[PDB]
Structure formats: C-alpha cells, structure tokens
Design an enzyme around this catalytic site. Structure first.
Site, PDB file in Angstrom:
ATOM      1  N   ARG A 149      17.939  33.419  65.913  1.00 30.77           N
ATOM      2  CA  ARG A 149      17.009  32.304  66.122  1.00 30.77           C
ATOM      3  C   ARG A 149      17.891  31.110  66.403  1.00 30.77           C
ATOM      4  O   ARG A 149      18.862  30.884  65.672  1.00 30.77           O
ATOM      5  CB  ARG A 149      16.121  32.111  64.874  1.00 30.77           C
ATOM      6  CG  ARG A 149      15.145  30.892  64.742  1.00 30.77           C
ATOM      7  CD  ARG A 149      14.665  31.001  63.266  1.00 30.77           C
ATOM      8  NE  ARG A 149      13.787  30.031  62.580  1.00 30.77           N
ATOM      9  CZ  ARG A 149      14.176  28.903  61.978  1.00 30.77           C
ATOM     10  NH1 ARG A 149      15.435  28.486  62.063  1.00 30.77           N
ATOM     11  NH2 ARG A 149      13.285  28.149  61.315  1.00 30.77           N
ATOM     12  N   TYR A 168      18.990   8.181  58.506  1.00 27.79           N
ATOM     13  CA  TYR A 168      19.024   8.181  57.049  1.00 27.79           C
ATOM     14  C   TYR A 168      20.383   8.660  56.539  1.00 27.79           C
ATOM     15  O   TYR A 168      20.812   9.803  56.812  1.00 27.79           O
ATOM     16  CB  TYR A 168      17.907   9.059  56.491  1.00 27.79           C
ATOM     17  CG  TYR A 168      17.821   9.053  54.972  1.00 27.79           C
ATOM     18  CD1 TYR A 168      17.896   7.864  54.251  1.00 27.79           C
ATOM     19  CD2 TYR A 168      17.653  10.235  54.267  1.00 27.79           C
ATOM     20  CE1 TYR A 168      17.808   7.862  52.856  1.00 27.79           C
ATOM     21  CE2 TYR A 168      17.566  10.244  52.890  1.00 27.79           C
ATOM     22  CZ  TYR A 168      17.646   9.057  52.193  1.00 27.79           C
ATOM     23  OH  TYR A 168      17.550   9.078  50.827  1.00 27.79           O
ATOM     24  N   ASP A 198      11.777  28.711  66.634  1.00 17.43           N
ATOM     25  CA  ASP A 198      10.775  28.199  65.727  1.00 17.43           C
ATOM     26  C   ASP A 198      10.259  26.853  66.238  1.00 17.43           C
ATOM     27  O   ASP A 198      11.035  25.930  66.403  1.00 17.43           O
ATOM     28  CB  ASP A 198      11.435  27.983  64.376  1.00 17.43           C
ATOM     29  CG  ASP A 198      10.443  27.791  63.265  1.00 17.43           C
ATOM     30  OD1 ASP A 198       9.271  27.470  63.539  1.00 17.43           O
ATOM     31  OD2 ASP A 198      10.866  27.940  62.097  1.00 17.43           O
ATOM     32  N   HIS A 245       7.822  25.121  64.602  1.00 13.72           N
ATOM     33  CA  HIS A 245       7.521  24.274  63.446  1.00 13.72           C
ATOM     34  C   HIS A 245       6.179  23.528  63.479  1.00 13.72           C
ATOM     35  O   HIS A 245       6.094  22.393  62.999  1.00 13.72           O
ATOM     36  CB  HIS A 245       8.627  23.244  63.247  1.00 13.72           C
ATOM     37  CG  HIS A 245       9.984  23.839  63.069  1.00 13.72           C
ATOM     38  ND1 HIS A 245      10.327  24.598  61.963  1.00 13.72           N
ATOM     39  CD2 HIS A 245      11.098  23.771  63.836  1.00 13.72           C
ATOM     40  CE1 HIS A 245      11.588  24.982  62.071  1.00 13.72           C
ATOM     41  NE2 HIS A 245      12.076  24.503  63.206  1.00 13.72           N
ATOM     42  N   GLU A 279       7.709  30.675  67.776  1.00 12.34           N
ATOM     43  CA  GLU A 279       7.161  30.777  66.424  1.00 12.34           C
ATOM     44  C   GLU A 279       6.485  29.505  65.916  1.00 12.34           C
ATOM     45  O   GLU A 279       6.937  28.393  66.207  1.00 12.34           O
ATOM     46  CB  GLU A 279       8.273  31.227  65.471  1.00 12.34           C
ATOM     47  CG  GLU A 279       7.981  31.046  64.017  1.00 12.34           C
ATOM     48  CD  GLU A 279       9.197  31.255  63.150  1.00 12.34           C
ATOM     49  OE1 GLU A 279      10.155  31.930  63.576  1.00 12.34           O
ATOM     50  OE2 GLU A 279       9.178  30.748  62.025  1.00 12.34           O
ATOM     51  N   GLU A 330       4.175  32.349  58.208  1.00 13.33           N
ATOM     52  CA  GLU A 330       4.938  31.797  57.091  1.00 13.33           C
ATOM     53  C   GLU A 330       4.067  31.237  55.972  1.00 13.33           C
ATOM     54  O   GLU A 330       4.273  31.524  54.786  1.00 13.33           O
ATOM     55  CB  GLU A 330       5.713  30.620  57.653  1.00 13.33           C
ATOM     56  CG  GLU A 330       7.030  30.325  57.030  1.00 13.33           C
ATOM     57  CD  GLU A 330       7.824  29.547  58.017  1.00 13.33           C
ATOM     58  OE1 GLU A 330       8.466  28.535  57.685  1.00 13.33           O
ATOM     59  OE2 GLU A 330       7.732  29.977  59.165  1.00 13.33           O
ATOM     60  N   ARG A 382       4.052  36.877  60.253  1.00 14.97           N
ATOM     61  CA  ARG A 382       5.174  36.509  59.380  1.00 14.97           C
ATOM     62  C   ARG A 382       4.849  36.302  57.886  1.00 14.97           C
ATOM     63  O   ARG A 382       5.619  35.649  57.177  1.00 14.97           O
ATOM     64  CB  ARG A 382       5.872  35.260  59.928  1.00 14.97           C
ATOM     65  CG  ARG A 382       6.512  35.477  61.296  1.00 14.97           C
ATOM     66  CD  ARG A 382       7.132  34.207  61.873  1.00 14.97           C
ATOM     67  NE  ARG A 382       7.939  33.414  60.937  1.00 14.97           N
ATOM     68  CZ  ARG A 382       9.106  33.785  60.399  1.00 14.97           C
ATOM     69  NH1 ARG A 382       9.616  34.989  60.635  1.00 14.97           N
ATOM     70  NH2 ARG A 382       9.754  32.960  59.579  1.00 14.97           N
ATOM     71  N   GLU A 442      13.453  38.291  58.635  1.00 11.35           N
ATOM     72  CA  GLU A 442      14.221  37.062  58.619  1.00 11.35           C
ATOM     73  C   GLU A 442      15.159  37.162  57.440  1.00 11.35           C
ATOM     74  O   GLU A 442      14.754  37.605  56.362  1.00 11.35           O
ATOM     75  CB  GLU A 442      13.285  35.855  58.462  1.00 11.35           C
ATOM     76  CG  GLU A 442      13.981  34.527  58.240  1.00 11.35           C
ATOM     77  CD  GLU A 442      13.053  33.327  58.418  1.00 11.35           C
ATOM     78  OE1 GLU A 442      11.883  33.381  58.000  1.00 11.35           O
ATOM     79  OE2 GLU A 442      13.486  32.322  59.005  1.00 11.35           O
ATOM     80  N   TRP A 458       4.778  18.956  59.828  1.00 12.35           N
ATOM     81  CA  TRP A 458       6.195  19.254  59.631  1.00 12.35           C
ATOM     82  C   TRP A 458       6.447  20.736  59.869  1.00 12.35           C
ATOM     83  O   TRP A 458       7.400  21.147  60.523  1.00 12.35           O
ATOM     84  CB  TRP A 458       6.645  18.870  58.209  1.00 12.35           C
ATOM     85  CG  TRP A 458       7.708  19.759  57.703  1.00 12.35           C
ATOM     86  CD1 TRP A 458       7.571  20.816  56.841  1.00 12.35           C
ATOM     87  CD2 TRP A 458       9.079  19.711  58.062  1.00 12.35           C
ATOM     88  NE1 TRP A 458       8.784  21.419  56.636  1.00 12.35           N
ATOM     89  CE2 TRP A 458       9.730  20.759  57.379  1.00 12.35           C
ATOM     90  CE3 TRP A 458       9.827  18.875  58.888  1.00 12.35           C
ATOM     91  CZ2 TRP A 458      11.089  20.995  57.496  1.00 12.35           C
ATOM     92  CZ3 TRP A 458      11.169  19.113  59.008  1.00 12.35           C
ATOM     93  CH2 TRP A 458      11.795  20.161  58.314  1.00 12.35           C
TER      94      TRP A 458
HETATM   95 MG   LIG Z   1       8.794  28.504  60.814  1.00 13.19          MG
END
Ligand SMILES: [Mg+2]
Ligand SMILES: [Mg+2]
Ligand SMILES: [Mg+2]
Ligand SMILES: [Mg+2]
Lengths: 380, 404, 380, 404
Positions: D147, D159, D212, D214, D238, D264, D285, D341, D404
């Site tokens: 990945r 930050y 991914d 996200h 993903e 996930e 997943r 994974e 997120w």
């Molecule tokens: Mg993910």
C-alpha cells in the site's frame, strides 16, 4: 393581432378574475384566472406582467404564447403562474374557434359523447338530512351524487381523523339502503388522512362500491398513494389543487388513481390539460375535472367543450352557481336529466357583462384551515 | 410577540426589490426578501393583498405554525409566487427571533461550522482572450472559486440596445417585452470546452472552476458535454437540462463524472427530492427567498446531506441584500455547505440596505449583529418607485421558443 | 467557553447517567446519557473520552461539536457512542436557550401545538385486570392508552409466539366492548414475531383499529417490514432501539411505518433527531418518541420541547417516574387532561440535585432476555 | 467447561490494548481482543462492568448462545463499543474451544484453504521520490502486495509536535485532544495519480498495488479518481467515501473498473449487506475484534463469497497480537480470502503477547499450536498503565469538520 388584453375582478357574491383579449378585427376572447383566496395575486401576474406582453402578438399562435409564458417566466410552475397562463390559453382558444365559426369542442376532435355527465353536491348535519338532500337531488335528475354529512361531535375548523374513520362508512350504508345502486356514489375526503388511514377507509367502504373516493391524503409526494392503492379496490380520484402534469405524472404512470381532477383554469388551459388528459388515457385513467363555485362560468363553458371531446371522459363536477353569479356571465349551455352540453355558438359560447361586473367590487375571502384537537395545523 | 404591522415595500435602485417588514408589539423589527425577478408585483400582491392582513393578530414567536399555516392554508400549495411570499415571512420571522435572543441568526441554527463562507464570482468575454483577462482580474481580487463563460463565435446579438456584454450581471432588462436571444446548442457543444481548456492552460488548477449551462441542452447533449470537459475538473457544471422531469438527470449521471449543480428555479423540496435521493446532483442551488426561507431551506439542506449533496445557493442581483445577509448566516452554519454565489450589488443597491457582512480573501461572514444584521432605509427606498424589467427568452434558429 | 464537563451516575431507584456542562459565565446545561443496562459504558465514553475534549470549546458551536464527536470517533454509530453524543447535544441546547432567555421549543420554531398528547401504560395478569387498569387510567385523563396483559400459561423469560397470536386479539376486543372507540389504542409487540406472523397479527386486529402496533419484528434488516406492510392496514410503529437515521431511513422511505419512536437520549439529541423527524415528515411519518422510566427527566423535558414544535408530532410515551426518581430532577412540566407541556423557563427548564443524587450510588440492573420453550435465545 | 473467571486488562506498551481473559473450571484459558482505538475504556467498561459478571455461571462450550445472548440480550444492538466487547468474548471462547480440541483454531473452521496468508505493508513519503525508496525497501523485504501513499505538495502540517511522517503507523497521538489536519480534496485529485504512475514506471507491475483514500471524497469525486488510476491496475482503492449510506458506493461502481475495498470501521453485516449484495465492493475489510469475532465474521465472509467478494481484513497497530493471531487462523481457512493487512508491532508491543505465527516471503501462517497460539504476559502488561491517545480529525480549508 391582439390589441387589448384586459383583466377584470368582480364579486357576485364570490370573487372572479376574468381576462378579455381583443384582436384588431373585433374578435374577442374570454378566460378564467380565478384562484380561490389568492385572486389578486393572479390579477397582478396578468395585468402587471403578462398582458402588456400580449399586445404586439398574433392570436393564432396559441402554442407559442403558451410556451413563451411557460418557459419565459423562468420560475416555471405554480398555482398563480398557471392560473394566469390558463386564462391566456382559454381566451385564445375562444378566439380561434370564433375565427373558425365553430363551437370549441369541434376544433378539439369533435364530440365523443352526446352528453356530459355531471355530479352534484349533497350534505347534511345528520344522515337523515343527507338522505333527504340526496333524494331531492336525485329528483332533480343527476345520475351522480357526491355525499357528505357531519360527524357527531381563515375560519379554523376542528379535525378528527379517528371520528371520521369510525363514522363515515355509516353514510354510504344508508344511501345504499334507502336508494339502490345504479346512481354513482361519490365522496370527498379533503386530504385529511394518512396513506394507511386512506387504505383502511377504502376497504371499509368497498361494500358500497363508490364511483370514487377523492383526495385521500396530500399528494405532493405522489408515492404516498401507493399504500392506499395496494390495499383497496375503491376507486381513487385526485387533482383539484394540481397545476401541472408534473404534479400527477407519477400518480398516473403507476396506476395509483382512476380519475384526474385537474381543471382548465388551474392546470394550463386547453393546451395543457389536453396533454394531461391524453397522458392519462394510456393508463386507463379518466377525467374528473373539478367544478366548484370558484371556477367562473367561463371555465365551465370551456370545460363542457373539453369534456364533450375527451375520449377518456369520466365525470364533470358541477357544484353550481348563483343566479347572482351567472348573470354576469351570459351562457348558452344546457342541462337535461343529468347531462350537460356546451353551446352551439362560435367559440366558448360565453359572454362577460362588464357594466354589471363593475357593480361588484372585489371583496376579500379566504378558504378555511383545519386544525387537530391539538391545534396542529392540518390539511383542510 | 404580537405582530402589529406587516408591510410590503417595492423599490428600484436600480433593479426591482420586494421587501417585507414585520413589526412587533414591543417594537422588534424583522425584514424578509420576496423578490421574484420579472414577476415582482405578483408576490407584492400575494403579500399585500392576501397574507399580511392575516399576519396581524399573530404571535411572531410561532414561526413553524405560521409557515405551515400559509404553506398548507393556501389550499393551492407550491410555486414561485406563493413560495416567494412565504419565505419573506419566514425570513422576517427568524430575523425577529434572533433579535429577541440577542444573537446573530447563525447561532440559533446550531452555530458556525466554519470560519467563513466561500463565494464564487462570474467572469465573461466575447472572446476567450477577454474571458481570460476577466479571470485574471477576479483572481487578483482573491476569489478562490470562479464561474466562467464567454460568447459563442458568430452569435453576438444584432440588437442595438442590448446591454450585451453586461447582462450576465443584470439579465432583466428595463422595458415591456423580454429581449429575445438566438440559441444554437450545436455551436455551444463544439466551442465551450475550448474556454475551459484555455483557462486551465494559462491559470492551472488551484482555483475552483464553475460553469452555467442555462438549461439549454437535452440529457444526452449534457451527458456528452460533461464528458468533453472532464479533463478540466470543473467544480460543477450547472443547470444542464430542464429539470421539471427529475428523471431527465439520469442520462447525464450515467455518462460523466463532471459534478452537477442545479436548483436556482426551484421553490420546494418536491422540486428536487428525486434528483437528490437518486444522487443525480452534487450541489443544490435553492435559495432562502425562493425555496421556503430558513425553515424550508434547513429541511432541503439536511435531506441533501444524507446523499452527500452540498449547498450551492444561487446569489444573483435579484436576491436582495436581506436574502444575502440571511444566506451567509445559513451558509456559516450548514454542515454540508459547498459554495455561495455572490453577484455584486451596486453601491446604489446597497445604500438602501445598510449591511454588516464582510469579505476577506474569498470568504464572506455575516454580521455578529443580532438578527440578520441588515436594515432597509425606507426613506431612500421611497425615492425609487418600481420599474418594469424582464428576463430574456431564447429562441432556436427555428424561431422555436426554447429554454432561457 | 466550556469550563467543566461533568458526568454523574445515580440510582433512585433505577440508574441514570447525567452530563452537566458549565461555561465560564455561569450558564449550565444538562443532558441525558442513560442507556438501560449498559450505563457505565456510556459514563466512561463521556468522562474518559469526550468530556476532556469539551473543555477549550465554545458552547455556541453545537453543530460543530456534534460533527466533531460524530465523525471524529472514527468508529461511527452505535448505542453507546450515540447515547454520549446526545447527552452533549442536549446539554448544549439547554445552554443556548438559557443564553437566548428562551424556553427550548422557541428556538426550534415555536409551538405547533397547545399540548403534547401522551400515552400511559396499562397491564394485567388477566383481561379483567387489564380492563380495570384501563378504566382507572382513562379516569386519570389520558386520551391514549397502551394495553398489554398476560398470556394464559438478566431474568430469562419464556416466549410463545403461537400462544400470543391466538390469544392477544381477544384483549383489544374486550377494551373496545367495554369502553368505546374514541381513545387511542396501543400495543407493544416487543420484537417477538417474524414478518409474516406480524402480518397475520395485524390483519387479526384490524377490527379494533389500533393507533399502532409497535416493534412487530426485529428491524436490523429493514426489508423485513415490507411483508407486514403489504398485508395489513393496522398502523405500525418502531424505533426505540434505533440510534441513527441509518437505522430507519429505509423503513421511512419505503413507507413501512407510521410512527418513528427514536429518542433524544439515544438517537442524536436535538440536532440528530431534528433531522430524523424532518425526513420522516416527507413520507407522512409521525413522531412516537419512546418515553420509558430509563430515560431520565432531563430527556422528558427536552422531549416535551421537541414535541411541542415538531409539525409531524404523533404521540409521546409517558411511562412515568417515581416520586423517588423525580425529586433528583426538579422539573416544571405540567399535565392536564392527557396533554403535557414543557416549562416556560429558559432552557430545558430542568435541574439536577447533585447532593441528593450523591445519596444514591450506582446499582447493577439488566433487562430481561427471552427464550423459546426450546431455550433458543430470542428477541426480548 | 464452566467459566470461572472473566477478566479485562488495559495495558499500554506503547499504544493502548484492551484484552479479555476467560478462565475455565478445568483451567483452560482463552484470550480475546477488545481494543477500540481512541475510545478504549468504554469497551473496557462494557466488558468489566456489564458482561463479565454475566459470563460467570456459563458453559464456555456454548459459543453461539453466548454470542446471541450478548448480541440480542443487549437490547440496544449494534455499534463499535458493543461489538468490540462481544467479539472479545467470542474470540476468547474459540481460543478455549480449539484448546479443548487440541487443535490450531483454523482446523476447527474447516482446515486450510492455502499454504499461507498474503500480507500487505504500507509505504509513505513526503515526496514521490521518498515513497519510491520506501517501496524499494519493502520490496526487498519480500512483500508481494504493498500500500503506497505520500504527502500532497503544500499540505505538510505546521504543527511542531506532529509525529508527522510517522503517523501513518500510529495515528492515535498521546494526549487529550485530537490532532487537527487540513484536507483539500481538489489537490488530492490532481496529485495522487502521479504517485502510482511513478511507482509503476520504476517498479513495473508484478507487485499488488494498494491505496487508502481515508473516506475523504464524495461518490462522484471517488468515481473520477478511480477512473484516473485505471492505467495502474490498483489491487484496490480503499475507503473512497463515507459509507453509512451504502447507496453512495453506486456512483463509484458505475464509473470505474478500479477495485474497491471498504470496511475498517464496520461492526456488523448490517453495515455492509447492501454494498456486497449489490456488488459495489471487491474486498470487505471488517475485522475479528470490531465485527463480531470468529462467529460473526465467518457469516460476513460467507455472505460476501456469494457475490465473489473477497476478505481484506484491516490490521493496524490498534488491533492486538491476539486479534492478529486470530485473523491468521481465519485467513488460512477462509475460501474467499483476498489479502491481510499487516501493520508491524513494535518489539515492546510483542513481548507482552508471546506469539507463534511466522512470516516467509510475503506470506504469514499462524501457530500450529492449539487455540489461537497467543499469550498475554500479565506481569509485563501490569508495567504499562493506560495512556490517553486519540485519532486525528480532519477539517477542510473552511474549518468545516470533515471525514478523517
Ligand atoms: Mg483505511
Ligand atoms: Mg376536494
Ligand atoms: Mg444558472
Ligand atoms: Mg417496545
């Protein structure tokens, strides 16, 4: 060439808004723009915004003027908008038929019927009052009668769905017991119910075999009629408050109704309502045009012409008018043994007495609203 | 708060605005916009003649019952004119309610979801070069999102009094009859993708790029056009095809991944329910003034959110600064916000509506004033009586009356 | 600026978990996080994980905090998660309305009703016990009464679908024979049936015209309600155990239910349940919020505010509380002749007696489970 | 086998793990993972305070009735916290059952479908070049499936205490408040396909290539993105778009042939039923710890298989080595297996959980030990008390709270 596009507003004793189109060569056309409770909104839409745009214009181009006002308004549909466009349409078909030296029904494809079946209104405070009312109206020769009566127990009215469900089948029972079948038996539900309450209502009255139950539940969401349709075989009618085929396209395409109640004044005139009628025919849906007091005799005329032609005609509502209402509108329609027929004169066959009209200034009047015991604002 | 006065004002400085002012017994004032370009006096009537005398006994606090009372109580239910009237009431009522609460209106809606509200401008040109300069002009003004158009070669108006190259700002033309424009879809299909090509080539990506199709194409035409602009990653392509038949957006969605916006002309959730639930659009452009005010528009937006549809409110000259101030409160709160349209107001227009929103680097923010943060100078309004002005119509080469 | 976010847990005599948010300027807000049987799971979710993240934060930003906790949790929905987020929401709207010097229903759009109809609980071991219970509760003035009684023949209880099908219509028959119609007649099925058993149940009780039958079959798969809906016109309600619009979006969109029973404490608070309510309105689905003992008076308050506003309000459940329960929560709601109304004080109009609360430590209590004669673990 | 003890342990070496240990009358021991990143103590409670005292009379043999007893018997039914608890029980119960049977757990599931279990690693970089080196590093380690991600130019955190370029391994950051990241979808759309281009160009195909997304994009955005990466033949793309509304995957599937993975964040078959039955995804997943343990996850996988959907279990740091050992038994048996994974565990983390799986040339294989083949060193666990740590949140340029 149209030379004048005039709007009149009169109250004998209820409000009517009327449009009068004059061409260069003297031909004159009449159209109904009456929208109950919002009359002056339409009057302004016409006088302030559509009428001046009708002046340079060729009366023959009915389709083009319709499209021009329909799409050119940009903000497209709606009760006020369409009440105006329909008035323009009605008056232009009046003119065209005069120009053809024909009654209007002739330009539409000619008579598909010898007579136009109408239904009357009957009411009471009690069942007994209702049955004497039905008997006198049967005596008057109507073959179709819409029956209402009170439940034991803007103007704000009180509404109880529950008291209505338990009681109102009792009416149709009485009507059928006294007088036989044969007559067509009608009822207006006034949008008061939920879809599943309407289903329940339908089942419970199947034994009396209604010609229809009308306006069962509010129909902005046309999917709400699906539930009633899967549960009852009592015929359904709807469409008074519709101004568009877009209001009813789903109800018809999914075979959710049996009668479409759209009207010439409110749904697009001859041009628009021709299209709605034709669409409904494909699904064996028939025409049940609204015919209350608050559509003026101009519309009644044109509606008797339309009704005379439509293949898929069902019924015409004829709530009726005052001798005080009708005398502003010299008419030539007839009635015989429960059938009406339009004039045989050129056009709509209708006139507008302006001088008499001017005797009757506008007076404000609004429809009632309904509220639950709660006070929650409901569907009147 | 007993409503004691309910007044309609029509002023023209220098385009028409219809404004409702509601006054309470204790003296709180709220303003609502009821402007409907090209048919303004119908709404004025709908408010003045039937509705405002009905608002006289009532408790201004009961915003919902009032909304339903007019919405359903008008037995004839939806539509541009009706809904313009109802929204004006609702907007005025929420202005009064935030004033009573001593709070900017957004605070009552759920508070801020963002530090500020992204706005897009328009740019145009007769030629691609012209449009690129207009783009560069607005880029240096700090706009992060820009809508671009330009003329189709061959198709300039032959009408000597056309405001022409203007018109993209103020399409309603003072007078009696609508201006008539000639439309060719075929020339649009062959030419317009070249505009976006040139823009992206000179000024790369980094700017959100918008474009208005003005209802002109059929579904399969819009489908092809969307395909043909995919390389340019438009933020949206707007008003593709007439949407009375919501099913017509399907052929478009099946064929392109270009984002789709619509809803300028809508007055109700019933105008867009199918489009949203079926995920045929990405941005819903309905407006506070035309689509049911705060009350009705919170519903549309929340429904949209379930389908990941964002708000992209229409904001032309013909919504008043009252509707603008109101939209900025809505925009600052609404979670699924996408973009806000910001057509300018002339100075003339704004000095009638003393305001307090601000603009900084492409983001707007409304008052921190209670209510909407907007006024209406009745003495200066009185100086500008109503002037007739109408939206164009489009005709094909045919003479066929088409979609403007 | 929020300065304190405190969680309290008390048992007088049933468990309540309460959240109290304090701002810098002294305004204070209350919220219900009570989740029957898993109370300490929510208490920890709040005290250990959400509350510290509420400290720097501006109380005004209700939407943002909701979204922040909803999406920021990453693992998104669920009974514990939502019981917490709803508590935060409730307390922040309490604060906002105080800040507006308004009762909460006012910020929501104002009162759509003069009163909030509630229903009570009635039960027996026999029909006769049930009818005397209904008669005393009718005497107490409720207009809506949910009726249960025993079938002839965690705590583990025994379940027989078959004995219930054959017997339970007999109850509604008795209720209707003694007392008329007029009152709204309710029943809780407790998820015990298969969809087709529920269809059968519905048909068999249509004659008694229930206001609703509630929780007919487990609803994780919302398609399971389709079968009941195509076979009966007895109204359906569901949604106690729902925490999300995602739990009920299909049931509502497909017009499978008439009443959605989601609750402020469990379904997202004012922010979330506003959205669920509004969505349901489009399909003429109405609100039937769960109101058991295990939702604390904090929720009742907020729910009377919500109910007072919602256009599409249906009914409110009011199982009621102990004088021992209520005195920890000083309230200002009223009851008159089967309607409730929230306070007219700023905010929710509710208080939390902390010192009294501290008299009552947490005590473990779990809901029963149901088992067939078999012993197979069933739906309680 | 009467359950005699049911204990929860919280240890942090050095990220949080919640572990359930069930002990039987005859002394068989089984472990279950109940870790829920960022909300760990809620599950700890859900286990400690309500459930573990209910597990005390019971026969450990009756795995199904126990699963249903907690699943349905909790009257409130699904969800991340609830399901984390239930899975921990179920996992511990199946560990005990294979121990009683003297068999590696996979043997009880139906035996092995394969000689070993393909795992994928992650690689990242601030720049494309960096990511290519990370790719080359993992390629020489024998990984057959990798990945890849890397930073979007312009978007590095400002930050100063960000673990930054790490973070892809341990996103939960020790502290009180979540780290806040700024997201731009538009810059992602324009940049990320270039990463895959460069990878395939330097290191051709032959490696399975994963990515991914996200949860950041909307359906039409994900649709476009999938299209734009088709040339690179991704093994999968993903978490394209939020999936609460499973219908949102439709626009994606209509427009691209890039393979789609998700799951996930799911805890139930009800989270993915529509997505699978409609063939909107290729890889599911969901995980043993979060999606119902052995019992609940065999059901999800078997359902998936009917639609030719394969398993692609999530395996980050925040599933404990107990869940890892358990996943490898599931993976070795499951017929419709796709990939596993494998985020690493630090040495620190693993010496708390003495294990016996192995890795050889990109394939893993669990114990041939009875049960799961995993322990829990309670004395070393006791050395690491719980430390608060939280997942980031993302905000758009707007300040808008986003996915997120
Ligand atoms: Mg993910
Ligand atoms: Mg009617
Ligand atoms: Mg546009
Ligand atoms: Mg129940």
């Amino acid at each position: 060439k149209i030379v004048k596009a005039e709007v009149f507003v009169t109250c004998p004793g209820r409000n009517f808004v009327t449009l009068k189109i004059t061409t260069e060569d003297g031909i004159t056309g009449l159209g109904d723009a009456t929208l109950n409770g919002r009359e002056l909104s339409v009057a302004s839409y016409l006088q302030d915004h559509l009428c001046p745009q009708l002046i340079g214009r060729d009366a023959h181009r009915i389709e083009d003027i319709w499209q021009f006002f329909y799409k050119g308004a940009y903000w497209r549909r709606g009760p006020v908008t369409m009440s105006a466009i329909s008035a323009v349409d009605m008056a232009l078909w009046d003119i065209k038929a005069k120009a053809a030296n024909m009654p209007l029904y002739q330009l539409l494809g000619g008579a598909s019927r010898e007579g136009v079946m109408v239904y009357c209104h009957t009411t009471g405070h009690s069942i007994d009052e209702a049955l004497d009312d039905y008997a006198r109206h049967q005596e008057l020769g109507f073959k179709a009668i819409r029956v209402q009566c009170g439940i034991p127990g803007p103007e704000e009215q009180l509404w109880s769905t529950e008291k209505y469900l338990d009681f109102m089948p009792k009416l149709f029972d009485a009507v059928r017991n006294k007088f036989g079948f044969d007559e067509h038996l009608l009822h207006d539900m006034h949008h008061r119910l939920t879809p599943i309450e309407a289903a329940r209502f339908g089942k419970s009255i199947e034994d009396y075999r209604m010609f229809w139950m009308e306006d069962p539940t509010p129909a902005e969401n046309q999917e709400c009629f699906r539930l009633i349709r899967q549960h009852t075989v009592t015929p359904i009618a709807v469409g008074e408050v519709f101004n568009s085929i877009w209001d009813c396209k789903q109800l018809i395409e999914e075979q959710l109704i049996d009668y479409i109640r759209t009207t010439l004044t409110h749904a697009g005139g001859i041009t628009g309502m021709r299209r709605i009628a034709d669409f409904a025919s494909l699904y064996q849906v028939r025409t049940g045009s609204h015919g209350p007091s608050d559509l003026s005799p101009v519309c009644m005329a044109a509606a008797l012409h339309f009704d005379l032609w439509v293949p898929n005609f069902g019924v015409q509502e004829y709530m009726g008018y005052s001798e005080q209402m009708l005398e502003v509108f010299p008419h030539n329609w007839t009635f015989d043994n429960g059938y009406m027929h339009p004039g045989e004169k050129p056009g709509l066959g209708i006139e507008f007495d302006e001088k008499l009209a001017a005797k009757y200034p506008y007076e404000p009047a609004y429809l009632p609203v309904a509220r639950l015991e709660d006070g929650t604002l409901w569907n009147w």
